[PDB]
Amino acid sequence: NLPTAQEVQGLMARYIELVDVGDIEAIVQMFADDATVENPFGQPPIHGREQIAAFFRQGLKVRACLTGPVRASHNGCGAMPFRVEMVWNGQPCALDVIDVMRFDEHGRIQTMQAFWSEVNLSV
Amino acid sequence: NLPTAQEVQGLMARYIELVDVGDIEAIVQMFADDATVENPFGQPPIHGREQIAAFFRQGLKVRACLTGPVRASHNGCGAMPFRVEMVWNGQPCALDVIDVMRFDEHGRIQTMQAFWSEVNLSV
Numbered sequence: 001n002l003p004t005a006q007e008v009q010g011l012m013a014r015y016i017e018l019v020d021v022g023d024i025e026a027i028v029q030m031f032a033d034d035a036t037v038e039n040p041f042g043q044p045p046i047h048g049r050e051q052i053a054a055f056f057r058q059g060l061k062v063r064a065c066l067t068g069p070v071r072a073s074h075n076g077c078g079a080m081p082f083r084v085e086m087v088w089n090g091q092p093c094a095l096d097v098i099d100v101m102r103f104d105e106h107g108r109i110q111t112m113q114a115f116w117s118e119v120n121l122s123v
Numbered sequence: 124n125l126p127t128a129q130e131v132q133g134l135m136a137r138y139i140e141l142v143d144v145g146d147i148e149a150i151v152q153m154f155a156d157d158a159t160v161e162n163p164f165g166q167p168p169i170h171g172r173e174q175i176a177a178f179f180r181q182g183l184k185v186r187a188c189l190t191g192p193v194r195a196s197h198n199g200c201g202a203m204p205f206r207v208e209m210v211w212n213g214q215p216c217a218l219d220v221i222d223v224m225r226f227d228e229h230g231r232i233q234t235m236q237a238f239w240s241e242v243n244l245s246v
């Protein structure tokens with residue numbers, strides 16, 4: 001059912017674990033089948049597991065890690081601070097991001113929003 | 124006008140500055156007149172500067188500080204990680220919070236959401 005606050009801290013931390021190791025099939029599986037992702041926030045959202053897998057396959061040398069604890073509410077919502085490290089066109093750089101996800105009655109990410117822009121890109 | 128990413132990083136950092144010193148009139152002034160605040164997220168929102176002032180007056184020995192950089196988008200939205208320290212009924216404790224605000228065409232906070240629950244309360 002609708003995850004509890006403590007359950008949310010876990011799912012979201014799990015998500016970063018997966019993104020960090022790059023297990024794409026496992027990552028795509030945490031989302032609801034018809035989920036919508038807005039990354040970065042402001043851009044048109046991607047919808048459904050097919051498009052989400054496509055996105056992650058395209059994006060993931062990349063390590064990620066929580067930079068602070070996971071803030072959670074009681075209606076299945078959470079937000080977390082984390083850093084994404086990579087190597088763009090040979091050049092190494094880091095991006096500071098905050099993710100806001102909403103889970104469904106099955107513990108799957110129903111909607112997710114990523115907050116970040118160039119001002120957070122430290123290259 | 125709609126603040127730019129860099130402008131958002133500033134307004135939000137300014138906001139924490141004010142909350143940290145407790146200048147209530149200055150804080151209430153950053154919001155639009157008909158703004159809505161959801162603190163914590165999930166609870167019924169408070170609406171308008173009168174209610175917002177009431178909230179802050181009630182809440183603010185309290186120090187606050189950004190615990191990570193401010194993530195910002197290009198459509199006037201931002202999210203930030205920060206810690207709130209206080210002294211509840213004689214006992215000292217800290218709360219980890221992440222705020223998500225949306226600014227209006229005047230640089231005023233139009234809507235604000237605070238993510239946190241007991242799991243972030245370290246007493």
Ligand SMILES: C[C@]12CCc3c(ccc4cc(O)ccc34)[C@@H]1CCC2=O
Pocket residue numbers: 019039059060062084086095097099114116
């Ligand atoms: C796609 C990307 C790698 C992963 C990633 C980015 C931005 C926000 C994210 C939010 C997530 O929850 C998980 C992964 C990312 C980067 C933008 C530039 C890049 O290489």
Ligand SMILES: C[C@]12CCc3c(ccc4cc(O)ccc34)[C@@H]1CCC2=O
Pocket residue numbers: 142162182183185207209218220222237239
């Ligand atoms: C009201 C409060 C002090 C301030 C505060 C809290 C929670 C989220 C916040 C978010 C803000 O953007 C600014 C101030 C607070 C605390 C909840 C318990 C408490 O004493």
